[PDB]
């Protein structure tokens, strides 16, 4: 009796930095996923545990829609079993992930001529993220024994790095918007369903 509000995730004016990735919960609604898997707008559309051409045949207890910006060369880390700067320190999918990863080039929206320094990723971290963990700390990173006391310096590094997206960069260094759909089929009743 409700349409799922997927547009406010996919079509939003601005996307989050991956270190601060957004999450919207989708529940008690219906969606025609045909508009999704019949779109040519997508450079990545990989599903795990479900077949993309079958999402209209399944119901789920809960759907989460996570979204962020990375560069093209990093979209391969948004998958189960992957390591790297994004999967280790920014956005991590579990090994038993059931859902879809959707990505598209956003150079025209997220690049700027002087460089867009508003999109950031975490470069320093003492340990890897657990699945679906979000780390928004901007504490100076202590890379030695001496504490940093909020001051950058030797062995004292700002932990985030700006992508500096520029429209003239190569494709793998251009911004890509990503939406991760997590389908949860638990013991609760079936709320998020598909239709024609």
């Amino acid at each position, epitope marked *: *009796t*409700n*349409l*799922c*509000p*997927f*547009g*406010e995730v*996919f*079509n*939003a*004016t*601005r996307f989050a930095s991956v270190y601060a990735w957004n999450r919207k919960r989708i529940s008690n609604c*219906v*969606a*025609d996923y*045909s*508009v*999704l898997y*019949n779109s040519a707008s997508f450079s990545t559309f990989k599903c795990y545990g479900v077949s993309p051409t079958k999402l209209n045949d399944l119901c789920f207890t809960n759907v989460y829609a996570d979204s962020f910006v990375i560069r093209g060369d990093e979209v391969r880390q948004i998958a189960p079993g992957q390591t790297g700067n994004i999967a280790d320190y920014n956005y991590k999918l579990p090994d038993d992930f059931t859902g879809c990863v959707i990505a598209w080039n956003s150079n025209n929206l997220d690049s700027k001529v002087g460089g867009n320094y508003n999109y950031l990723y975490r470069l320093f971290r003492k340990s890897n993220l657990k699945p679906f963990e979000r780390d928004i700390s901007t504490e100076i990173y202590q890379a030695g024994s001496t504490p940093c006391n909020g001051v950058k310096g030797f062995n004292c590094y700002f932990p985030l790095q700006s992508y500096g997206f520029q429209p003239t960069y190569g494709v793998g260094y251009q911004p890509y918007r990503v939406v991760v759909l997590s389908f949860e089929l638990l013991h609760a009743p079936a709320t998020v369903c598909g*239709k*024609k």
Partner: antibody
Amino acid sequence: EVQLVQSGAEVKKPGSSVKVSCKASGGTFSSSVISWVRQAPGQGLEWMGGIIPLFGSANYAQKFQGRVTITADESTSTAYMEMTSLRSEDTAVYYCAKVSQWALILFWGQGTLVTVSS
Amino acid sequence: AIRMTQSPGTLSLSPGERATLSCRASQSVSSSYLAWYQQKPGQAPRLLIYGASSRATGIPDRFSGSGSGTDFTLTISRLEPEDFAVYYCQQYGTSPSWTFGQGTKVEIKR
């Protein structure tokens, strides 16, 4: 991609009815909110009502609840606005406007002029 | 129901000036579902802004939308002579229940 094409202009006498169509192309019809908007000459835009063709339960602005029937046909991707007991005050351009559940943009038809005159 | 009141009803400015148009909602409204339209006499409304801040195709970047909750704004950073027109705001959503603001006219000051 998506395109909304409304039926042509109408001249109707007081007391008659009018049924305006809006044919959608693009495959976003069923999972969309399809609304009808009126603009009387010299006046602003007024939302009349809308429907989701997946559920078929139309919802109307209070000002239009009696004389307007909004229907949608999934088999032909065509939405309809029927207004009964027309009066001169119903002279306006009627627009169909559409929102897909998958985007925040709105798609509009070109407008249909309805002139109520004997 | 939700009521969108625009202010001012008439904006009287010279070309080159900055225009700030307001849209106030009787309740809090999601910023994802707020739109702005431009209409010129004898013409159909033209979508300018959707999702509070996204520009539709062909819209110059002197048009910017902002706001959240109950207060939304359309800014025109430097009026060109083509920018003098009537502007409507619109609350919408994924339910069939939408409302338009009553209109702000941007006219030449004299």
